[PDB]
């Protein structure tokens, strides 16, 4: 039953091991 | 083929619909389509023929055109400007407004005489001054390490060159306020009683309920103004400028600055203009008041005819600029500009510190543990000349930043020279219109002038010879 | 030398929310702010002189 | 840590380096250019024989 | 739970599974206070983004 | 734009300036600082009245004689005639408007933006403040 | 690039890098000293008209 739907948001995931806080990194 | 873009947009909290510029390209060419790999943005999801229409500063996609003429909010460009719209909204773009047509009927012997007029008025914000600053080389460059020291002193005098200038900086700021504001040998002392013949002055007084002793006006400027850092017992960003970067306080605390304006107040509604020039000399309101209107070719009768509506009008502009200053979105912008410019220049400078700078890490202690010197002088000296580059153009902008504030600060020692102690006949420089009285108020790093003016009502034609 | 990381200043207790894969506590600076104990798995801090 | 260790003709020392392209350094050894660490060698005369 | 059918092209079936593809992007994400994740926004989307 | 001038069309010269930090962002910032100014500074000179004033039909004025600064209908600018030796006495070299040799040679990033007020609308503010100060 | 290698075009780039930024910084310190008198210059015309 192959079939086509929207993925929306999702796939966050941590991209280091170090502790932030109020913080607003940006990663690519 | 290529240029620039450019996104026009309403505020995010109002909505979500944008429009694009390309910049100075026809829609003729690449614009026309979009296909994978053939436009950096890689976004595709423009139609790139929906509603495209053609600009001299370059074609527009995502607005359409409306042949009306508005006052402009967003300007794009030779004329033409956008703004947001209800059809059941989109944003459009049009042609500018210059204002509203009318004509005058100039003829041989025609001369229009006003009958009436009108008390009003207006504001007025400076900038005064900025927040002080010192820093040192020794702990910015080449914090807690003694090699980095004995590396950098070879540089020769690229550090004292930056404290000399820093405090220079520093001693012209706290000057500024003493020049704008000591215009007043004697502080002088409200009246006992405030009566002043219908004239209602209890808003800009002091207070003395309030411990702060602060006018009501003076009380919402200083709430609507925020600040970031004022320096005091330092001891979350304000904290984390423990890598050098300090920020002393200013001399005159906001106390006797506040004893300055009073006194000013005072002596400008006791005394005229007199304790301008010498001592101080009493003289009741209305008679001030009388001659300031002499001063604009008025004969003093039509105030001592129409004095109770002089002062009903005065009443009445002086609750409504309360409101007026309060109910506004965004009217103090210049102070608040004033710090946030140094607010980001701060940070900025911090941030520059997390930067390789082509050396293999940005924390010296690992660099200097890990490696055997030879290297490590290499390494260190790549740093301390990225971060010296880094430094030195912090203080080139602050000297030009200093300076234009400079210049501020003696327009605004002037217009409180002329305008305040006397009344000036410079066309539009003391106020629109013809002008009367000026009073000075204080604010986080500025003043504020409320400036009260004459200006003509309905008129009526005759004819002259 | 918290398994490296020459350094000097103030150690106290915090109260930071180190997932267990958590390591290193950083701030805007790329200079760190918190470390956690490999002896003991404890939450530190660390403050300039 | 990790230790890769083979035997090579000794006249390619200087293929044996990060971003150095030779018969075995394009298909055979392949070293990227951000390693950190050394390398030891010596004569093999009595391994080899 | 596996019936079977000839399904594509932008339809709807129950498969109990799902599967995407990943690209290289740039992502701006903000922390809270508690260090947790909360939002994040690619810069690839749309021009507002 | 920086990228364009010093790593022009280089993937790997364009990776190793992510190096510097943020010596782009100040010089980005430092010259929209200026850009912005430009377009306030001829608002101050010239936007003086908030309406725009139209000069009378007959051009009479007691004896004196202002055809030389009013405005002539005649030329499609509808500019007075003293303007006109003002723009042939003055040689601009570029406006930067769809400049499509060495003008063109500054297509390395160095982009001229055309100003807001377009010298068109100029003349209606010089018209409006001169009409209203003769009658 | 095509003369060179990754090992040392990287350094014979950071040569010519560093060469263009410090001749850029220079057009823009000169632009702001030149605007700021154009600023005083505005400003008394504005005043005169
Ligand atoms: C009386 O005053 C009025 C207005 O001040 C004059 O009326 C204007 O005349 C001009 C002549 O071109 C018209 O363009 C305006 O539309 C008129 N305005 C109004 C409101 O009517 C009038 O000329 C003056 N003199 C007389 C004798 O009425
Ligand atoms: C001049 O303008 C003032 C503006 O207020 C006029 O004052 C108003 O007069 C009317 C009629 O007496 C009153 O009902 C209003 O309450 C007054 N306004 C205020 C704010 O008190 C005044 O009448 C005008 N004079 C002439 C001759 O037109
Ligand atoms: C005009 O002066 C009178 C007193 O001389 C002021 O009267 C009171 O002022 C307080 C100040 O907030 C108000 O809360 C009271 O409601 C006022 N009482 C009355 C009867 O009006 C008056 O506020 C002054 N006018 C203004 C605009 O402040
Ligand atoms: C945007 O406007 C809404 C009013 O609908 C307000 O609640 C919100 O705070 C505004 N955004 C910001 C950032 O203040
Ligand atoms: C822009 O497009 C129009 C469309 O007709 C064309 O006439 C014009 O020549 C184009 N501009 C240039 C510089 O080619
Ligand atoms: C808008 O005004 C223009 C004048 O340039 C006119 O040609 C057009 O018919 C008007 N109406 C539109 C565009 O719907
Ligand atoms: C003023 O009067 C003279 C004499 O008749 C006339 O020629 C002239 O046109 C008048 N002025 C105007 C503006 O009409
Ligand atoms: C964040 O921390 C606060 C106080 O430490 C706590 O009340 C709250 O529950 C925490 N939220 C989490 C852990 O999601």
Known sequence: TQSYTNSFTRGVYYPDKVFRSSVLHSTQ | SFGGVSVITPGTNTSNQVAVLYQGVNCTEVPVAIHADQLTPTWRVYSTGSNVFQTRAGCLIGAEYVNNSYECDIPIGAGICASYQTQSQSIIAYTMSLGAENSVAYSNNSIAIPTNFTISVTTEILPVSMTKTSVDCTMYICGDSTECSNLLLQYGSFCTQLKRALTGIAVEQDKNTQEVFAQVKQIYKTPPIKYFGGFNFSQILPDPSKPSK?????????????????????????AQKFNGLTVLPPLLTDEMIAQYTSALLAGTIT??????????????????????????????????????????????????????????????????????????????????????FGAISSVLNDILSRLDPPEAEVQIDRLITGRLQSLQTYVTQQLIRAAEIRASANLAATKMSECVLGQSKRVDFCGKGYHLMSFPQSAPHGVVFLHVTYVPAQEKNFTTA | NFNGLTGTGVLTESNKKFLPFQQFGRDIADTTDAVRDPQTLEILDITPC | VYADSFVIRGNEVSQIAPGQTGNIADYNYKLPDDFTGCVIAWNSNKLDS | LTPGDSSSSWTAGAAAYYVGYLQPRTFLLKYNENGTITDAVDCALDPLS
């Open chain 2, 214 to 238: 602060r006018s009501p006006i003076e009380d919402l400027l200083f709430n609507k103004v925020t600040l970031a850092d004022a320096g005091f017992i330092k001891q979350l960003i304000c």
């Open chain 2, 271 to 356: 005394s005229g203009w007199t304790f301008g020039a010498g001592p101080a000399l009493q003289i009741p309101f209305p008679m001030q008041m009388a001659y300031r209107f002499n001063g604009i070719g008025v004969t003093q009768n039509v105030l001592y005819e129409n004095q109770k509506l002089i002062a009903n009008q005065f009443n009445s502009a002086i609750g409504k600029i309360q409101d007026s200053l309060s109910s506004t979105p965004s009217a103090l912008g210049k102070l608040q500009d004033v710090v946030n410019h140094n607010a980001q220049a701060l940070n900025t400078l911090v941030k520059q510190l997390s930067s390789k």
